[PDB]
Write a protein that binds this ligand. Structure first.
Ligand code: CLA
Ligand code: CLA
Ligand code: CLA
Ligand code: CLA
Ligand code: CLA
Ligand code: CLA
Ligand code: CLA
Ligand code: CLA
Ligand code: LHG
Ligand code: PQN
Ligand code: OCD
Ligand code: SF4
Ligand code: SF4
Lengths: 155, 92, 143, 80, 740, 86, 41
């Protein structure tokens, strides 16, 4: 009558099903998130991820900074976030051109885990596609944070 | 039964405990807006070239640091400066 | 032994709660090992990955990631319960390989059925110096 | 992996095969000692380099030597 | 079932075993072939588990060793009482506690050494002590030196009795394992008898003899005209004159009219304005309550009369859904292994020592103790170090138990098995918490350093610029201050003056002033939390991975104290549980040094000082809030601004502190030689020296080897801790004695 | 798994715990009622509620500890009836 | 008695006989004869 047990009836693996992971509220919520969605196209995945990140990478940068006390300059201090998401897109493309090397294809193991196919995000062109979507999404999210922070109304 | 030799793609741990497959997320034609928008940077050399040309923004950005009025180029202040450093000599 | 016992599935694995130290992404991408033995009764042994598990009667099969873990469980069962285990190495494709005991008697016996390898008929100290084996890629011991 | 060597000054006490924790060394028959057996090492690719065989060797100097070399996934003791 | 199982005359009493030095172990009986035999003889002298597997013999050995320790402590206590009786100035300090400094050690004039005999005042000269023995001897009435002489003689008699008891219980009447395994009887007698009767007897002493300190000594009466303690015990009129409730004579106690004893059983929240310590009547009422609590607590378990409880039943009746079985074999674990009990006892003992350190400076309980900054800082620092050493020892013995007395048969699905099952998750989470605390607690200091260096003081984490205030502690302080008005009506005031608003001062010097909290307090508190998490990470990893790790699967059979497992797998040096304790000891030192530094600087800059008519002036310039935000502030305003007394201490009375300061530095610098080098280098160097001795035929009969791999680590950590602790000791003592 | 035991009758303690909180009238008038009247002036987005407000934070924390400990004991005692845990 | 006198020949004969003798000799020399910086020649 314990809430903790192994996964698939085989306990010799490291992942032991604990309440946190087992939790249906956690299971369905994680699946709903834009990265775990496999059928949706990679460009689409990258845009959603980039929008959320580009928007959250502005506030902590515009409130605490070198020009956080200058009124109009403080709004203009959010550009750095754009430079940050630019550095993030560059390192993401660098990881894609090296993770799934041309020599190493699938990398083996089809993976069962209930009737469903391998995510195309792990391909060579799929990571570049994701890198694109993340770049447009981050640039657009930073621009939305800057536009919304001046017409937010009673912020 | 706990281990199989042929169907080893299910007995060792090769699973997806958080992924569902569906062809729908975003509304109709919204995806098309983002498809055309993300088509240009879709390639590796394309994005690396984008950020490489966008890297010149730091060079140009520093030149337009006049609005920022950074201590660097504003002045060093002639009135007060450390030209009297040390007590043995006026300058050195 | 007299014939390499082919590893077969559908063997009763020991009752054990879910551990945390074992079968990572290498156990699937590269290789992993599996130990089988025969138990005469119901006892509780200590796995080399965490807590304790019981010994299900009849055959027993366990899977690990390193050969040292299977060898550690092998010596524990041979010195604490007087058993005779044997483990295999399963590759990524699915090629099973017999590993211990290869000759099948035990690795500490003679059996007169194995040829010696990696032996130097000279004594240590009679090896030539580093200067002699230069650009030869070989070493004094290798020579 | 590491290179293990067994010299002729071996006495065949079978202690290194008992001290090896990865089943690398074995005992083959010989005709040069009182025990008429000499150690060997067929599974050199499984050598990890813990040097327990050298501590188990009773003769002076050691009849078995573990010369460390290149490292692989098996010789580095990686479980991931 | 609970009886007295004794086995008379089990070991003879002769000196035959004293001849052969190595006899407890079967390995050292062969004699000393190599110099390593001497070090093995000393390192295995107390490892009783390695002597035999007889639990009864092991239990008898530890029972006699306890009596030997008690005799040693009693001899030391008697020595302190005798020194205070003959070589001190207690009688002179008793008539002027605010002007004469304590001293209880006189040095003989051999090579120089007259300078150490410093003029402490009162027509006496000697070494100034910082132990607080004079304040303790003031708290329980003690006027002349005859009582201290009698206490020293009585303690020596009790020490001889304890040593005789140890010899008797190991050679003449040794108990049995069935006698030692009565944990219910032991808990019943330790809670009811030891603690309860000790509090009741001490309450009686404070009710009768602590009367001069609470009514005549504080009133300005000369200590010679004060009546002897037995006069207050025999004559009821002489005690009734001081406290009128004593005229009732045990009538309100038995007639349940306890309200009549309200004059000598007060509940006053504060300090005595004439002495600076707590009220003696409050401490007496406190001990009386504690005695009743423990006396009613010692009747929980069942021994021989049916009524009571069973510890095995209480443990086995606690099974939940998240822990499987839970507490299944905990009774069998705690009743058959000494290391498990030792780990639990050492953990709670060290934590208790830390509690003692905090509450002593917070609520000073001895008269004229708060105005003695030397003894205050000394007592706090000493109790903190003793507590930290004990917690590291607890982390050591838990791994010793897990390596030797852990049987994976009686623990199938209990808490111990589940904990060892998810050890990877535990260690990984503790690792992340450690890294997060380090970045967020040290990057703020480095950030303030860079912001101050770059000329931008408005961009640093300080009270003037961007701040971080500890609102939770500020709210708790406010709650404790306004608490005696709503949530403590019978209390006169707050239990301490740490959060109050009324500064008390005895003799012009501040006793206990309110303590404020700012951004620097937030920063140093996060520093403390970070170092505590790293120490618990190293110790807990060692305990959870001491059995068998995923890298080395046979670590249990390798033992507890082993060098490594060879140069395989890239290298496995210090993979043993003992090595984790060695690493832990280092981190405990790094944590407690910052704790005592924070205490000394905060007290010297915010509480201690001297009060005048135009305000109160602290010891330092009150620079705790404006100089603790930067790392350069510590090195400049603490170690460099202070320690000038230690530096300029030559030729003065406290000249030994400069020598101790430089000497401690050498020991710490000497530890690095043993800690960085290996063993093969020293073995080959020793070989060359052996050749030189062989050339002159002075080759030692016992061949001279180098130290072991674990011995070099042990020698290095011992020298390191000794050097660092003695450095901080000499600095603290010289600074607070020459200033406070 | 995937069915963590929750009964809709568990609210009986969090709903029967308050009557029990209103009982004590010796100090002020009630722990819970005092919590309600003191929180009553801090509901329309007021800056009040600083460390000086001993009637808001303290009553909130004390009342919450009582409510959470009784909800915990209620779930253990209710769901423990079927699992042979009296 | 033989065991006690042979016990007294291990560590006390070298750490408490010689140490006490040498320390007492140097201390009594520095006590009766005060502080010596030259051969007093
Ligand atoms: C003069 C009386 C006397 C005599 C003749 C013996 C004789 C013997 N005892 Mg015994 N014993 C005695 C008194 C005596 N004991 C007392 C008073 C106690 C209680 C503490 C014990 C408790 C005891 C135990 C538990 C054991 C013995 C054992 C033994 C036997 C061998 C151990 C040995 O060599 O002793 C050791 C010789 C010494 C000189 C030890 C001195 C250590 C002292 C006390 C420490 C002093 C602290 C030091 C000054 C601190 C400074 C250090 C610094 C770094 C801080 C031996 C036949 C052992 C045994 O029976 O073998 C199985 C055994 O385990 N005894
Ligand atoms: C923990 C250490 C620490 C911290 C907290 C800070 C903090 C800060 N520094 Mg700083 N600094 C540090 C160390 C640190 N520093 C060190 C060691 C150095 C020397 C190398 C410096 C040198 C330095 C300089 C030269 C400057 C600063 C500046 C600043 C300020 C703005 C910097 C910035 O880009 O905004 C923050 C940008 C971010 C991207 C922060 C990200 C926040 C993360 C994501 C946490 C929030 C989400 C969190 C994970 C919650 C989880 C959510 C859940 C759903 C998962 C800021 C308050 C600037 C300043 O002017 O100060 C006012 C500045 O010029 N620092
Ligand atoms: C302050 C720290 C310190 C000290 C004192 C030493 C001291 C020494 N090192 Mg060393 N070393 C150190 C740090 C230190 N090292 C560090 C950090 C390293 C890098 C890991 C090294 C690496 C190193 C190597 C590789 C070697 C040395 C060697 C030596 C010895 C040189 C011989 C000599 O100079 O005559 C003596 C100098 C002294 C300072 C003697 C100190 C003893 C005095 C007299 C105090 C005596 C104690 C007193 C009687 C009280 C005792 C009682 C007490 C136990 C309670 C010497 C003892 C060499 C050697 O072995 O020489 C043959 C050598 O091979 N060292
Ligand atoms: C109410 C009776 C009583 C009292 C007062 C004590 C007191 C004590 N016990 Mg004990 N115990 C008792 C009953 C009692 N015990 C019973 C019935 C059992 C059997 C289950 C045990 C089994 C037991 C064990 C196994 C151990 C103790 C130990 C201790 C000592 C702990 C030392 C300490 O922590 O600081 C306190 C120190 C003091 C208060 C100093 C006082 C010193 C005096 C001489 C103590 C005299 C009390 C004594 C029990 C009187 C009866 C003996 C009589 C024949 C002379 C302490 C003096 C530990 C020990 O042995 O330490 C030596 C320990 O290992 N006890
Ligand atoms: C736990 C320690 C303790 C002790 C030892 C005492 C002791 C004493 N208290 Mg007391 N007291 C205490 C705690 C204590 N108190 C506490 C906690 C409170 C509440 C705060 C009080 C409050 C209090 C009050 C109000 C009074 C006392 C008083 C007294 C004295 C007389 C009481 C009396 O006559 O009772 C009974 C005494 C006995 C029954 C005698 C014991 C039997 C003897 C020893 C037997 C020996 C006989 C033997 C078999 C043969 C003799 C040997 C011979 C042949 C050589 C007495 C000396 C009174 C006082 O002030 O005295 C002036 C009094 O007024 N106390
Ligand atoms: C209740 C206290 C307590 C008790 C009873 C024990 C008991 C034991 N411990 Mg232990 N331990 C403790 C606390 C305690 N420990 C604490 C507080 C720590 C943290 C420092 C440790 C850390 C520890 C470790 C790492 C180890 C033990 C080990 C052991 C076992 C054998 C020890 C031995 O052989 O003694 C030998 C006696 C000595 C070595 C003498 C000590 C000399 C010290 C190091 C010098 C200190 C210098 C001194 C303070 C100042 C001198 C200055 C100089 C000028 C003279 C033994 C059962 C060992 C074991 O293997 O367990 C099975 C083991 O390796 N303990
Ligand atoms: C000053 C020396 C020093 C330093 C800096 C560290 C630092 C660290 N030790 Mg360590 N250690 C030391 C000495 C030191 N140790 C010594 C002498 C010993 C022997 C006893 C040990 C023994 C020891 C053990 C046993 C362990 C550690 C661990 C750790 C890590 C814990 C991380 C953490 O929680 O805090 C935070 C980390 C830091 C604050 C590092 C400083 C980073 C600053 C803020 C720079 C910020 C980044 C900068 C802006 C970027 C630079 C830009 C550049 C690339 C251009 C940490 C990084 C533990 C560990 O591994 O972690 C879990 C561990 O278990 N240490
Ligand atoms: C073993 C080295 C040593 C030597 C050579 C001496 C020598 C001396 N000691 Mg002495 N002593 C020593 C060790 C030594 N002591 C130690 C270790 C202690 C501590 C226990 C003492 C404590 C001591 C005291 C208390 C006294 C002496 C005194 C004396 C002197 C007179 C004794 C006498 O006449 O004997 C024979 C002379 C032979 C030349 C004498 C010159 C006495 C003295 O002061 O003289 C007035 C004195 O009272 N010693
Ligand atoms: C202030 C202290 C630190 C604050 C943060 C602490 C969180 C970090 C560690 C949490 C790990 C979670 C894994 C739980 C492991 C676990 O689930 O154990 C199981 C336990 C329930 O077990 P059972 O009911 O089955 O146990 C019954 C029998 O085993 C009885 O022995 O659940 C809980 O522990 C509830 C407490 C959750 C965590 C509470 C924190 C405890 C710290 C002290 C109390 C703090 C209260 C608030 C004060 C501010
Ligand atoms: C120096 C050193 C040695 C050599 C250690 C030795 C030789 C021990 C020295 C012990 C001495 C001999 C003890 C006595 C000390 C003095 C003689 C005391 C002075 C007393 C005089 C008054 C006579 C190691 O063996 C070692 C091993 C592992 C890591 C580091 C090291 C290491 O650093
Ligand atoms: C160590 C063995 C001796 C143990 C008993 C010690 C008895 C000591 C009794 C007190 C002696 C005090 C003598 C003081 C003489 C000078 C008096 C002036 O203050
Ligand atoms: S080094 Fe270790 S693994 Fe290699 S042969 Fe020797 S004992 Fe075996
Ligand atoms: S331990 Fe040494 S002597 Fe013995 S069999 Fe092995 S190589 Fe030969």
């Amino acid at each position: 009558q314990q809430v903790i047990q192994p996964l698939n009836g085989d306990p010799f693996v490291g992942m032991l099903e604990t309440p946190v992971t087992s939790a249906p509220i956690v299971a369905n919520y994680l699946s709903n998130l834009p990265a775990y969605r496999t059928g949706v196209a990679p460009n689409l995945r990258g845009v959603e991820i980039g929008l959320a990140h580009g928007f959250l990478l502005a506030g902590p940068f515009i409130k605490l900074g070198p020009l956080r006390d200058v009124p109009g300059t403080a709004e203009v201090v959010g550009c750095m976030s754009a430079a940050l998401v630019l550095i993030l897109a560059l390192c993401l493309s660098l990881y894609g051109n090296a993770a799934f090397q041309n020599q190493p294809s699938m990398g083996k193991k089809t993976l069962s885990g209930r009737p469903l196919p391998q995510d195309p995000l792990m391909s060579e062109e799929g990571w570049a596609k994701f890198a694109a979507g993340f770049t447009v999404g981050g640039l657009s999210g930073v621009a939305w944070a800057y536009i919304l922070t001046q017409v937010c109304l009673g912020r | 039964k706990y281990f199989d030799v042929q169907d080893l793609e299910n007995t060792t741990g090769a699973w997806d405990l958080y992924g569902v497959d569906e062809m729908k997320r975003y509304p109709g034609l919204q995806e098309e807006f983002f498809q055309r928008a993300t088509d240009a940077v879709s390639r590796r050399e394309a994005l690396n070239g984008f950020v490489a040309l966008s890297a010149g923004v730091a060079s140009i950005a520093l030149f337009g640091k006049g609005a920022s009025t950074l201590e660097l180029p504003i002045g060093t202040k002639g009135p007060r400066m450390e030209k009297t450093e040390n007590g043995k000599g006026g300058i050195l | 032994p007299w014939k390499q016992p082919e590893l077969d599935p559908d063997t009763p694995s020991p009752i054990f709660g879910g551990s945390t130290g074992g079968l990572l992404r290498k156990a699937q991408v590269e290789e992993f090992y599996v130990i089988t033995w025969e138990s005469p009764k119901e006892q509780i042994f200590e796995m080399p990955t965490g807590g304790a598990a019981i010994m299900r009667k009849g055959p027993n099969l366990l899977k690990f990631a390193r050969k040292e873990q299977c060898m550690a469980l092998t010596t524990q069962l041979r010195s604490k319960f007087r058993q005779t285990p044997c483990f295999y190495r399963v590759y990524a494709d699915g090629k099973v390989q017999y590993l211990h005991p290869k000759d099948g008697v035990y690795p500490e016996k003679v059996n007169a059925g194995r040829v010696g390898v990696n032996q130097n008929m000279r004594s240590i100290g009679k090896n030539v110096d580093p200067i002699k084996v230069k650009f030869t890629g070989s070493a004094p011991f290798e020579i | 992996a590491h290179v293990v060597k067994i010299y002729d000054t071996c006495i065949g006490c079978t202690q290194c095969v008992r001290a090896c924790p990865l089943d690398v060394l074995e005992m083959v028959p010989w005709d040069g000692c009182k025990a008429a057996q000499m150690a060997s090492s067929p599974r050199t690719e499984d050598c990890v380099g813990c040097k327990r065989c050298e501590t188990a060797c009773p003769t002076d100097f050691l009849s078995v030597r573990v010369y460390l070399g290149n490292e692989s996934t098996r010789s580095l003791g990686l479980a991931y | 079932k609970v009886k007295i199982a004794v086995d008379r005359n089990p070991v003879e009493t002769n000196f035959e075993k004293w001849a052969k030095p190595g006899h407890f172990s079967r390995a050292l009986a062969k004699g000393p072939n190599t110099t390593t035999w001497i070090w093995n003889l000393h390192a295995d002298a107390h490892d009783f588990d390695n002597h035999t597997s007889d639990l009864e013999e092991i239990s008898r050995k530890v029972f006699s060793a306890h009596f030997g320790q008690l005799g040693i402590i009693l001899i030391w206590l008697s020595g302190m009482y005798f020194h205070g009786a003959r070589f001190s100035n207690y009688e002179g300090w008793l008539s002027d506690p605010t002007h004469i400094k304590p001293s209880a050690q006189v040095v003989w004039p051999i090579v120089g050494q007259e300078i150490l005999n410093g003029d402490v005042g009162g027509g006496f000269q000697g070494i100034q002590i910082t132990s607080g023995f004079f304040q303790l001897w003031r708290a329980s009435g003690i006027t002349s030196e005859l009582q201290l002489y009698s206490t020293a003689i009585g303690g020596l008699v009790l020490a001889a009795a304890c040593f005789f008891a140890g010899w008797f219980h190991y050679h003449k009447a040794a108990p049995k394992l069935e006698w030692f395994q009565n944990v219910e009887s032991m808990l019943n007698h330790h809670l009811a008898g030891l603690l309860g009767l000790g509090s009741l007897a001490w309450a009686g002493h404070q009710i009768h003899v602590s009367l001069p300190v609470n009514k005549l000594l504080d009133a300005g009466v000369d200590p010679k005209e004060i009546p002897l303690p037995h006069e207050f015990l025999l004559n009821q009129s002489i005690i009734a004159d001081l406290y009128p409730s004593f005229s009732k004579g045990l009538a309100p106690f038995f007639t349940l009219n306890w309200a009549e004893y309200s004059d000598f059983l007060t509940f006053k929240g504060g300090l005595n304005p004439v002495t600076g310590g707590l009220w003696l009547s409050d401490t007496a009422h406190h001990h009386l309550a504690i005695a009743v609590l423990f006396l009613v607590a010692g009747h929980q378990y069942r021994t021989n009369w049916g009524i009571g409880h069973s510890i095995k039943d209480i443990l086995e009746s606690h099974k939940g859904p998240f822990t499987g079985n839970g507490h299944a074999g905990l009774y069998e674990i705690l009743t058959t292994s000494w290391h498990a009990q030792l780990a639990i006892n050492l953990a709670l003992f060290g934590s208790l020592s830390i509690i003692v350190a905090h509450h002593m400076y917070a609520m000073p309980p001895y008269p004229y103790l708060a105005t003695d900054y030397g003894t205050q800082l000394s007592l706090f620092t000493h109790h903190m170090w003793i507590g930290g050493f004990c917690v590291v020892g607890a982390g050591a013995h838990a791994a010793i138990f897990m390596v030797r007395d852990y049987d994976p048969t009686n623990n199938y699905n209990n808490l111990l098995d589940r904990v060892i099952r998810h050890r990877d998750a535990i260690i990984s989470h503790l690792n992340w918490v450690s890294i997060f605390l380090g970045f967020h607690s040290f990057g703020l200091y480095i950030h303030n350093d860079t912001m101050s260096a770059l000329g931008r003081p408005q961009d640093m984490f300080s009270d003037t610029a961007i701040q971080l205030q500890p609102v939770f502690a500020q709210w708790i302080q406010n709650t404790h201050f306004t608490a005696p008005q709503l949530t403590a009506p019978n209390a006169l005031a707050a239990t301490s003056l740490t959060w109050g608003g009324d500064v008390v001062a005895v003799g012009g010097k501040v006793a206990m002033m309110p303590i404020a909290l700012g951004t620097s307090d937030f920063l140093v508190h996060h520093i403390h939390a970070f170092t505590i998490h790293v120490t618990v990470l190293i110790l807990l990893k060692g305990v959870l991975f001491a059995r068998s790790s995923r890298l080395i699967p046979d670590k249990a059979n390798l033992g507890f104290r082993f060098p490594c497992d060879g140069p395989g797998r890239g290298g496995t040096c210090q993979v043993s549980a003992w090595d984790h304790v060695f690493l832990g000891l280092f981190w405990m030192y790094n944590s407690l040094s910052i704790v005592i530094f924070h205490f000394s600087w905060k007290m010297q800059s915010d509480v201690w000082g001297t009060v005048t008519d135009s305000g109160v002036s602290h010891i330092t310039g009150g620079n705790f809030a404006q100089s603790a935000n930067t790392i350069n502030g510590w090195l400049r305003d603490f170690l460099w601004a202070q320690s000038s007394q230690v530096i300029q201490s030559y030729g003065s009375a406290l000249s030994a502190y400069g020598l101790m300061f430089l000497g401690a530095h050498f020991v710490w610098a000497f530890s690095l030689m043993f800690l960085f080098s290996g063993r093969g280098y020293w073995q080959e160097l020793i070989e060359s020296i052996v050749w030189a001795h062989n050339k002159l035929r002075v080759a030692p009969s016992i061949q001279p080897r180098a130290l072991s791999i674990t011995q070099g680590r042990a020698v290095g950590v011992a020298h390191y801790l000794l050097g660092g602790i003695a450095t901080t000791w000499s600095f603290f003592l010289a600074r607070i004695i020459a200033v406070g | 798994l995937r069915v963590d035991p929750i009964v809709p009758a568990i609210s009986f303690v969090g709903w029967t715990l308050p009557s029990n909180i209103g009982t004590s009238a010796l100090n002020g008038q009630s722990l819970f009622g005092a919590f309600y009247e003191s929180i009553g002036q801090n509901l329309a987005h007021w800056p009040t509620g600083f460390a000086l407000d001993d009637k808001f934070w303290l009553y909130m924390v004390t009342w919450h500890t009582g409510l959470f400990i009784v909800m915990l004991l209620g779930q253990v005692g209710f769901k423990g009836r079927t699992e042979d845990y009296f | 008695m033989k065991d006690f006198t042979t016990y007294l020949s291990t560590a006390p004969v070298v750490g408490l006989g010689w140490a006490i003798f040498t320390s007492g000799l140097l201390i009594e020399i520095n006590r009766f004869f005060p502080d010596p910086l030259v051969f007093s020649f």
